[PDB]
């Protein structure tokens, strides 16, 4: 069921930088994950213009934010294009390599962590607040998969057997013990309002 | 040879807003067109990861900025994914409709013109400085096309017979008489430095 993979060494060191650097403006994680969901939703939307059947796995284009204090998770759910297995294992890592290097150059040169999205690697900002990230995803062409990593240089992929999700991606943030402020309705709302206010898809912030 | 099309009424009114509103910070046009080229280059790059032959029409992934004082044009050239005929005539217009409406709502509500890129319609910022825009583009699946518009509610498309470009998109800005500062090497460099400094593709600013 479970395959284990090594991050390429550059992503590994980016993840450790994110995890070990002292940086108090952690909230930008949420903007990066939302902006990712928006791009994925733009992508399936555009694709559907030439192949309307690509929306057979779900017509609604949206983003949901789901805090769970019991599990201490914040989940970002979209009905975007999703990721194939090849994306999870390979394509996105290839992509992340030059973005990482550029970002890592920019930082030595005085850029700061909040600029991570400009380098195509904003997903890894999840590790500002999350000790473990689980990503469930479903692309029209492929099976539903669960990717997961607590950093430390590796990650897993397995075919997923929880609730079928139709199409999209769900990012589950297992929050660090000191980052539970991001389970709070008021804190989430404050962040979405500040950083994500012009996203062209409804964002629903679920309550508990 | 030449087909003439009407903009949908919402894009028409956006273009007139861009053309008639008093707004002195015109330089952001260049950031929007560069950011467009970057996304198009990300797109062909990603596609090539699963189909390396998509790079048979050119391996180099780059952006060139070409001022021409004699013709009074500034051209932004990329070797990105390019646009099919259906994109030019249809797909991009469909896309632009909700971005426009959202942007136009945001403006009534106090947002300003520089935020146009957040709504997916930054291309039309070209009309801050250009009395006419000509776009030459070539997608792997299709022929080379020339799109063109001086606004006033319509646009043309024709198959293009100038130099074959292999793959990509060239945006030719016929500048308004009072906007020739954007032909100046120093002004362009100043703008790219300010707004476009972390683009992950070489940007070459040609001199005359
Ligand atoms: C480098 C890198 C870029 C992007 C990711 C995650 N990307 C995605 C991809 C999709 Cl289809 N949907 C969402 N929400 N996120 C992971 C790594
Ligand atoms: C709404 C709207 C969005 C985008 C455009 C132009 N888009 C593109 C498309 C491509 Cl493939 N390359 C570049 N450089 N620009 C035109 C209109």
UniProtKB/Swiss-Prot annotation, chains A, B:
Give, from the UniProt record, the effect of changing residue 82 to D.
Abolishes ATPase activity
**Gene Ontology biological-process annotations:** activation of innate immune response; cardiac muscle cell apoptotic process; cellular response to heat; cellular response to virus; chaperone-mediated autophagy; chaperone-mediated protein complex assembly; mitochondrial transport; neurofibrillary tangle assembly
Which segments does the entry list as coiled coil?
A: none
Family membership noted in the UniProt record: Belongs to the heat shock protein 90 family.
Instruction: Give the function comment from the record.
Output: Molecular chaperone that promotes the maturation, structural maintenance and proper regulation of specific target proteins involved for instance in cell cycle control and signal transduction. Undergoes a functional cycle that is linked to its ATPase activity which is essential for its chaperone activity. This cycle probably induces conformational changes in the client proteins, thereby causing their activation. Interacts dynamically with various co-chaperones that modulate its substrate recognition, ATPase cycle and chaperone function. (Microbial infection) Seems to interfere with N.meningitidis NadA-mediated invasion of human cells. Decreasing HSP90 levels increases adhesion and entry of E.coli expressing NadA into human Chang cells; increasing its levels leads to decreased adhesion and invasion.
Domains: what does the record tell us?
The TPR repeat-binding motif mediates interaction with TPR repeat-containing proteins like the co-chaperone STUB1.
How does this polypeptide assemble, per the annotation? Homodimer. Identified in NR3C1/GCR steroid receptor-chaperone complexes formed at least by NR3C1, HSP90AA1 and a variety of proteins containing TPR repeats such as FKBP4, FKBP5, PPID, PPP5C or STIP1. Forms a complex containing HSP90AA1, TSC1 and TSC2; TSC1 is required to recruit TCS2 to the complex. The closed form interacts (via the middle domain and TPR repeat-binding motif) with co-chaperone TSC1 (via C-terminus). Interacts with TOM34. Interacts with TERT; the interaction, together with PTGES3, is required for correct assembly and stabilization of the TERT holoenzyme complex.
Name of the protein: Heat shock protein HSP 90-alpha
Q: Which organism is it from?
A: Homo sapiens (Human)
Q: Which residues of the full protein are shown?
A: 16 to 223 of 732
